[PDB]
Amino acid sequence: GPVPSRARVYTDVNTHRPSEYWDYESHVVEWGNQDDYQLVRKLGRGKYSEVFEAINITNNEKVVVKILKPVAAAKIKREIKILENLRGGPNIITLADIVKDPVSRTPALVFEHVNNTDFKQLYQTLTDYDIRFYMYEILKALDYCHSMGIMHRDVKPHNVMIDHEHRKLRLIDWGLAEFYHPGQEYNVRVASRYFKGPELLVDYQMYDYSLDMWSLGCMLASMIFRKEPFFHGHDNYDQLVRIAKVLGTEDLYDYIDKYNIELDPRFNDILGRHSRKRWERFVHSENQHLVSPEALDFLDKLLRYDHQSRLTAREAMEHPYFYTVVK
Ligand SMILES: Nc1ncnc2c1ncn2[C@@H]1O[C@H](COP(=O)(O)OP(=O)(O)OP(=O)(O)O)[C@@H](O)[C@H]1O
Ligand SMILES: O=C(OCC1CCN(CCNS(=O)(=O)c2ccccc2)CC1)c1c[nH]c2ccccc12
C-alpha cells in the first residue's frame, strides 16, 4: 500500500486546539435576518453556488451575497467555521453574516464588497514589479491559513480578488477548504483541473498544505510566460501528461516509487518518456521582460512532483525574487 506522509510545517496545530476549533459539525449557527439585504444583480452562477452584488439596508453598505445550492449545502458548517477562525487575517475575505434564503431553505453567506473583480482579468497585463507585489500578497494569506491549520484546496485566478487602484488583494471562496489532521486521507476531487497537484492526479490521498503551493506555482508560470493556462490538460489523465512534458518522466517515476503510489494502468501508454525541460524554453520576445534568474529559480522550487520538497509559504516569502518588493 502507499507510504504515509505528513506536512513538514504546522503539523500538529489542530491536535492542541480545543475540539470546538476544528469539530465544525458540533458548531451552532446563530442565524441572521435575510430581510436586512436587497439583491441588486447576479454576478455569477456555478455548479455549487450563486453570487450577488447586494446592499445592507440597516447601514446603507455594499455587500456580496453567496447562496448555496441544495447539493453543496451539506458542508456549510465547515465553510462557516473556517471563515470565522480566519476572520481578520491578512488578505482573507471577511464574513459579515449568515442568513437563510427567503424562497428556499438553503444557507446564504454575506461578505464585504471588493472592487475590480477577478485576478484573471488583470494577471495577464501586469508589469514584472506588480507580479512580484501581488505574489507576495497571496503568500501572506496562504501562510496565515496554513499557520491556522487550514488548506484552501482551490487556489486559482478566479479565487483572488484584486483592487488594482488601491493595490489590495483578497483570497475568496473557502467552500473547498479543510482542516489539516496528520495521517488523514482526503478526497482527491478538489481544485480546478489546470491547478490540480500531481498528488491529486495519481490518486495520493495523504496530502497537505503543499497542494496550495503547486496551484500557486501554476499561477506564477501563467503570469511570467503569458500562457493561460500553463498546463492545458484535456481531462485529469492528459493533465498529468502535460505536466510530464515539462518536468520530465524520470522525476515522476521517482515520486511514485518514494511513496509506493499505484499508477492507473491507463497511464502506461500515454505518459511516454520525457526529459526535464529548462524554464528558458518558455521565454520569448513578448514575455522576456517578466522573466529573471530569480523568477525561474523560484518557479523551479514550487513546481516539484514531490509535495514534501516544494517551498512552504514562509520559505517562498524569503526568496530573492521578493527582494525588490517594498516592505
Ligand atoms: N467578496 C466578493 N467581492 C466582490 N466580488 C465577488 C466576491 N465574491 C465573488 N465575487 C465575484 O462574483 C462573480 C461570480 O463568481 P462565481 O463564483 O460565479 O465564479 P467562480 O465560481 O469564481 O468561477 P469558477 O467557476 O471558475 O470557480 C465573480 O466574477 C467574482 O469576481
Ligand atoms: O431577494 C432575495 O431573494 C430573492 C431570491 C429568492 C430565491 N433564491 C433561490 C434559491 N434557490 S436554491 O435552490 O437554493 C439555489 C439555486 C441556484 C443557485 C443557488 C441556490 C434566489 C434569491 C433576498 C433578500 N435577502 C436575501 C438574503 C439571502 C438570500 C436571498 C435574499
Terminal Cα separation, in Å? 47 Å
Largest sheet descriptor: 5 strands, antiparallel
Main-sheet strand order equals 1-2-3-5-4
Tell me roughly what share of residues is in helical segments.
Answer: 25-40%
Q: Which outline best applies?
A: globular
SSE order: HHEEEHEEHHEEEEHHHHHH
Under CATH at level 1, the class of the largest domain stands as: Mainly Alpha
Q: Class by helix and strand content?
A: alpha+beta
Total strands: the figure is: 9
Task: Give the names of the bound compounds.
Answer: adenosine-5'-triphosphate, the ligand O=C(OCC1CCN(CCNS(=O)(=O)c2ccccc2)CC1)c1c[nH]c2ccccc12
Counting DSSP H or I runs of 4 or more residues, the number of helices is 11
CATH arch. level architecture of the largest domain: Orthogonal Bundle
Enzyme class: transferase
EC number: 2.7.11.1
Keywords: Apoptosis, ATP-binding, Biological rhythms, Cell cycle, Disease variant, Intellectual disability, Kinase, Nucleotide-binding, Nucleus, Phosphoprotein, Serine/threonine-protein kinase, Transcription, Transcription regulation, Transferase, Wnt signaling pathway
Family: Belongs to the protein kinase superfamily. Ser/Thr protein kinase family. CK2 subfamily.
Primary descriptors:
9 strands, two-stranded antiparallel ribbon, monomer, Phosphorylase Kinase, domain 1, 327 residues, alpha+beta, five-stranded antiparallel sheet, Transferase(Phosphotransferase), domain 1, phosphoprotein, 2 domains, binds adenosine-5'-triphosphate, nucleus, Casein kinase II subunit alpha, identical protein binding, binds ligand E8K
